[PDB]
């Protein structure tokens with residue numbers, strides 16, 4: 001899986017270990033081993049949510065399978081949870097887009113997963 | 115809805131009001147209240163379009179509904195106009211990817227919209 | 229077609245000409261004229277892949293058609309090769325998302341491609 005966070009929060013507000021924590025928790029939540037989890041944190045961004053410049057985030061989780069109704073609520077609870085506690089971002093100022101990828105449409109190691 | 119602009123235009127040429135202006139014009143164009151609109155502007159990017167490094171933009175509009183053949187043609191006018199006037203980008207150097215998101219695939223406030 | 233690379237490799241390791249080369253290679257590989265090809269390189273990113281912050285990359289290729297089982301393998305070979313050769317990134321620390329865009333969902337110059 002691939003998790004990306006874009007936020008207006010400063011670089012200096014990202015705690016040491018946040019990428020490690022996201023990796024480990026997305027492994028648990030997703031059922032996929034840690035070695036397949038990629039994480040990307042883009043702080044200091046020029047953004048607004050509802051016309052306000054308070055702390056916010058635009059995020060995406062891409063995964064081959066492991067994407068659906070209940071799973072996505074469950075991921076949003078986890079991720080909103082972490083964004084609140086670690087980055088101090090209100091859960092109502094987060095969007096997370098979920099993408100179920102076909103294996104044939106993910107390249108890796110000179111090939112695809114199809 | 116969510117709107118993202120990636121551009122090689124420098125940070126200093128992004129007007130201070132650009133995120134609000136986007137926010138407001140997107141609310142009108144989509145029919146959704148401004149509160150639902152998130153906007154992200156990423157300047158100083160290392161980009162080329164058609165092999166030239168003249169000013170350009172790669173953008174995305176994600177929304178739950180309000181995406182279609184007719185609406186997308188319309189949004190391109192609006193957004194090429196804003197980018198042309200505010201960032202001095204030629205409209206032929208602008209791509210915009212449109213995504214019609216399922217409610218179950220959009221996380222927000224510890225849950226999803228489903 | 230549109231190709232984006234997000235990497236933790238530093239800005240100073242991106243060779244001069246990398247954007248041109250990508251453009252050239254994507255044109256030949258897709259059979260689309262170079263004028264329709266946009267490339268975007270984002271270095272210095274805060275990323276982890278499998279828990280490790282060794283060199284890695286997360287990438288997207290968006291294109292109207294020219295996306296499929298075999299074409300995507302061939303693109304992966306080409307692009308991981310280029311990421312291995314120019315950015316010193318190991319192929320198994322690269323993910324590439326392929327998206328077959330409907331023409332009506334790509335805005336360009338005040339309209340769509342539908």
Ligand SMILES: CN(Cc1cnc2nc(N)nc(N)c2n1)c1ccc(C(=O)N[C@H](CCC(=O)O)C(=O)O)cc1
Nearest residue numbers: 001002031032033036062063064065101106113323325
């Ligand atoms: C068969 N599966 C998933 C899967 C399901 N159940 C499991 N159960 C167990 N006990 N262990 C596993 N390793 C496991 N893996 C897989 C198919 C492809 C990929 C994969 O290696 N990578 C992509 C990368 C996605 C992206 O970047 O877009 C992914 O799974 O999301 C992994 C697992």
